[PDB]
Structure 1
Amino acid sequence: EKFEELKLSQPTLKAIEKMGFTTMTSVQARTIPPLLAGRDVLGAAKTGSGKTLAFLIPAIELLHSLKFKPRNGTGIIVITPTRELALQIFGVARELMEFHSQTFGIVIGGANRRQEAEKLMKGVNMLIATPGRLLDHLQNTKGFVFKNLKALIIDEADRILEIGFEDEMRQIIKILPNEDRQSMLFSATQTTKVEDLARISLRPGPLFINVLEQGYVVCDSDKRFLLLFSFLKRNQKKKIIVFLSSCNSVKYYAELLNYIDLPVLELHGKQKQQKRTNTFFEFCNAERGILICTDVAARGLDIPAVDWIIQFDPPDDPRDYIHRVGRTARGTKGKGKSLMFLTPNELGFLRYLKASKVPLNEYEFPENKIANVQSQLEKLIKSNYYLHQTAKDGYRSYLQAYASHSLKTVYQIDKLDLAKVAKSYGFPVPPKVNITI
């Protein structure tokens, strides 16, 4: 069916029109009449099917049917493992709530605690959060309007369990009310301990719908962005997609490289989704273009057969990266050459690549061929306030992305020279970011 066929409030209709959605994906078209019906649900769907919007529509329907004040309650609660997925879900949800009247917020470990605290003191009518920081905010923030719980959703309980936040989740649900609460949850696969949390969460009986060499380039953390720029100039007139972690670094690298006037398309959660669709369409039809994107915005959509996969940032799911390069090779008869940047702290990832048993190719670097624009970068950052702030934001979100990373054995912040990271961003002195180290 269509989104515009179903019974909806008119600002939600304007929202769906402006997000470009008319049609429905089939599994979400299945789950939406139980989503309106008020039953609990679990669901198996691929990461990036639009399954955010699938719950976003009847959640805002519930908030519209209840019309309660921002002081009145919180209601819709969203639990999501990754800070990046949290920002993507939030950025999709912003315009949806913006045509609506209610309130939207963020709770993320790695954000400023007095910020999130003051937002909770004001009250937030739709919460999106990481599991670890929720125990802090429920146990510590006073006066926060918790007793309502109109609903609750979990996304990718595989990833919560694979991180290991499930005990935190049990403490949360033991804090959570149940009788007003309905629980909806999406997870592409399932295990037993997923189902144990599901048996606690799902208050009625639910009906549920279930439907090769790599490049690796070891570089120091300062010169890696420069080498990306050099390799991108050398491979100009070849379409290449670069995978990042943080949307701020996406926007900043895109604005930077457009200031260096080589044509670059950005693709991130802060990008408006109609503009996002325009950029993806222009990349797919232009066939010689630079695409900067995060990991999971790239996960959310199928990829044309590309000259290069370049992964600059650390991965969200390395297992999904191993499956993703295999499905990329088997899907694309045109050869797509995959590479990842490495830092000399990261070589244990390589042995996990040796756990993946796929072959590996080391791609070498000449120190003579260095683009040498870093002085121009620093003069630019000392010049432009706007570029200065976007550079600081990419740096900040980059470090918070490392903070939010699961594999500590692959990534330790203690290993990293933040001076070189700042010089890669172009700062001679690393700016202060309030990060537990």
Structure 2
Amino acid sequence: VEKFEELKLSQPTLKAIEKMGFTTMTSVQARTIPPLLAGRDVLGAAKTGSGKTLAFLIPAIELLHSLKFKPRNGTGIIVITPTRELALQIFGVARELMEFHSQTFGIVIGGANRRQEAEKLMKGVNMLIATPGRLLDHLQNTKGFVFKNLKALIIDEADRILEIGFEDEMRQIIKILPNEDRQSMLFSATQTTKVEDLARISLRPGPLFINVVTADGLEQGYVVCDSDKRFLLLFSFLKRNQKKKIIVFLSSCNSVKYYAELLNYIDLPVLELHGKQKQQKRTNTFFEFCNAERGILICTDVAARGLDIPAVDWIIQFDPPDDPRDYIHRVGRTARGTKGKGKSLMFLTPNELGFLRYLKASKVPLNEYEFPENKIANVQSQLEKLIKSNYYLHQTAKDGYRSYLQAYASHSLKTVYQIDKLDLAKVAKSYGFPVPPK
């Protein structure tokens, strides 16, 4: 099995990998990490969110650490991670090593702060994590302060990247990118062969194709919340006396953070997961929850990949996540699952019911809606009179709010959300501590 000792990489590199709690590396990783080490292009395909972060990742600190002294100025490697969510996460895997030294890591993101962005690019970030289009902005603008020395190029989660509407961004970047000594890589977990004929550019010899490989026993629960400030008493979901097994989707790590301390003060079982946890507490928490029966946890599209705690009574789909691929077809989670029982609710600001129709365009007959009270006065004041992280500073629980609107913001045609109405505008009815949020 793949362990840290064989590769004979730097003591700090894998010595710090020893701090992720991994005592060894998986078969998808064993199928890849030493196999990659070469001028050899690699095309990743494997289990969804199987841990390939390490897999295609370790090339970066390897190639660069061999060149470590070098350019340090021309940014070494570029990853393209389409989804604002997974982008910020796999950057969470750029945080991976304290013993990362020679490297710096660009968070280059849709909806981040441009002046902040390039204002930090002038300092010569060593390795960056981007999203394609506004990345075109910075290689059209700042390229002299960044661009030409590039080493390795990897497309991570090629999923929507290669699909239509990012193609201009792509063919433009790769056409501009210094392919000369560039190391071409196209990665994903699982995507089609149509990638190939869409990959015809930035493929030269050396590559090889690595593959290591709604459910109707389950109905998808449904809710309609008019008030875009929508909050829920999970106690009536928890009326079983402390005993529930509940999984709760929401958008971003900032947001799961907020809801975590907040719903910690409405006194519920509190266990959470996001990019900002290290791998240590991702282990402790998720495996603690496989050692847990009574309780809940909150997971964004990070843990939407393959991770198993069985027979979860409830999958809360709250603030609908990225991908209707996963949204629709990951429901063999409960059934046809580990064959546990429960259902999955999503709290919908009203107008987006056409998403529902899109889902019923994906032709699952759906049922439920009940009467949650967005007029529960308590939860109205039980949140936004009380102050905590925005009570630390004027910059914080905002950041909760921000994060929500940015992940919600990236979606335009992806979701049904109209540029005109609630996207982003009328949803600002959820704005602040101040209410009504004009």
| TM-score computed with the length of structure 2 as normaliser | 0.90
> In the TM superposition, what whole-angstrom CA distance separates every residue of 1:96-115 from its partner, at most 9, and x where no partner exists?
26533311111112000001
Which secondary structure state, in structure 1, belongs to the residue aligned with residue 128 of structure 2? strand
Which secondary structure state, in structure 2, belongs to the residue aligned with residue 267 of structure 1? coil
Mapped contact 2:80–2:154 kept (Cα < 8 A): yes
2:360 is aligned, of 347, 350, 354, to 354
CA 1:37–1:395 in 2, change beyond 3 Å: closer, same or farther? same
Residue 238 (structure 1) aligned with residue 238 (structure 2): no
CA 1:338–1:22 in 2, change beyond 3 Å: closer, same or farther? same
CA 1:410–1:233 in 2, change beyond 3 Å: closer, same or farther? farther
> In the TM superposition, what whole-angstrom CA distance separates every residue of 1:238-289 from its partner, at most 9, and x where no partner exists?
1101011111000000011112222211100011110111011111112111
State the alpha-carbon separation in 1 of the partners of residues 400 and 50 from structure 2: 27
RMSD of Structure 2 on Structure 1 (CA): 3.0
State the alpha-carbon separation in 2 of the partners of residues 293 and 366 from structure 1: 22
State the alpha-carbon separation in 2 of the partners of residues 309 and 404 from structure 1: 24
State the alpha-carbon separation in 1 of the partners of residues 79 and 391 from structure 2: 35
Q: How many residues align?
A: 432
State the alpha-carbon separation in 2 of the partners of residues 195 and 231 from structure 1: 47
State the alpha-carbon separation in 2 of the partners of residues 84 and 383 from structure 1: 22
CA 1:220–1:413 in 2, change beyond 3 Å: closer, same or farther? farther
In structure 2, the partner of 1:435 is: none
> In the TM superposition, what whole-angstrom CA distance separates every residue of 1:325-374 from its partner, at most 9, and x where no partner exists?
13531123221311111111211111122122223122211549836232
CA 1:224–1:190 in 2, change beyond 3 Å: closer, same or farther? same
In structure 1, the partner of 2:118 is: 117
CA 1:406–1:295 in 2, change beyond 3 Å: closer, same or farther? farther
> How many angstroms does 1:394 deviate by?
1.3
Mapped contact 2:224–2:348 kept (Cα < 8 A): yes
> How many angstroms does 1:196 deviate by?
3.4
> How many angstroms does 1:412 deviate by?
2.9
Mapped contact 1:71–1:123 kept (Cα < 8 A): yes
Residue ranges of structure 2 left out of the alignment (5+ in a row): 214-218
State the alpha-carbon separation in 2 of the partners of residues 426 and 205 from structure 1: 54
Tell which deviates more after alignment, 420-429 or 77-86. 420-429
State the alpha-carbon separation in 2 of the partners of residues 163 and 312 from structure 1: 28
Which secondary structure state, in structure 1, belongs to the residue aligned with residue 299 of structure 2? strand
Tell which deviates more after alignment, 130-139 or 183-192. 183-192
Mapped contact 2:47–2:189 kept (Cα < 8 A): yes
> How many angstroms does 1:71 deviate by?
4.8
Mapped contact 2:86–2:302 kept (Cα < 8 A): yes
> In the TM superposition, what whole-angstrom CA distance separates every residue of 1:140-165 from its partner, at most 9, and x where no partner exists?
22532211111010022232134620
Mapped contact 1:70–1:123 kept (Cα < 8 A): no
Q: Is the helix fraction higher in 1 or 2?
A: 1
Mapped contact 1:392–1:431 kept (Cα < 8 A): no
Which secondary structure state, in structure 1, belongs to the residue aligned with residue 149 of structure 2? coil
State the alpha-carbon separation in 2 of the partners of residues 59 and 175 from structure 1: 21
In structure 2, the partner of 1:315 is: 321
In structure 1, the partner of 2:38 is: 37
> How many angstroms does 1:178 deviate by?
1.0
Mapped contact 1:395–1:425 kept (Cα < 8 A): yes
CA 1:286–1:388 in 2, change beyond 3 Å: closer, same or farther? farther
> How many angstroms does 1:295 deviate by?
2.0
Which secondary structure state, in structure 2, belongs to the residue aligned with residue 295 of structure 1? coil
Q: Percent identity?
A: 100
> How many angstroms does 1:51 deviate by?
0.8
| TM-score computed with the length of structure 1 as normaliser | 0.90
In structure 1, the partner of 2:158 is: 157
State the alpha-carbon separation in 1 of the partners of residues 7 and 42 from structure 2: 20
State the alpha-carbon separation in 2 of the partners of residues 70 and 27 from structure 1: 32
> In the TM superposition, what whole-angstrom CA distance separates every residue of 1:158-190 from its partner, at most 9, and x where no partner exists?
321346202210000010111210012213444
Which secondary structure state, in structure 2, belongs to the residue aligned with residue 94 of structure 1? coil
In structure 2, the partner of 1:69 is: 70
CA 1:383–1:398 in 2, change beyond 3 Å: closer, same or farther? closer
Mapped contact 1:245–1:313 kept (Cα < 8 A): yes
Mapped contact 2:251–2:320 kept (Cα < 8 A): yes
> How many angstroms does 1:377 deviate by?
1.9
CA 1:197–1:381 in 2, change beyond 3 Å: closer, same or farther? same
Mapped contact 2:42–2:185 kept (Cα < 8 A): yes
Tell which deviates more after alignment, 66-75 or 37-46. 66-75
> In the TM superposition, what whole-angstrom CA distance separates every residue of 1:72-106 from its partner, at most 9, and x where no partner exists?
32111000110101011001111326533311111
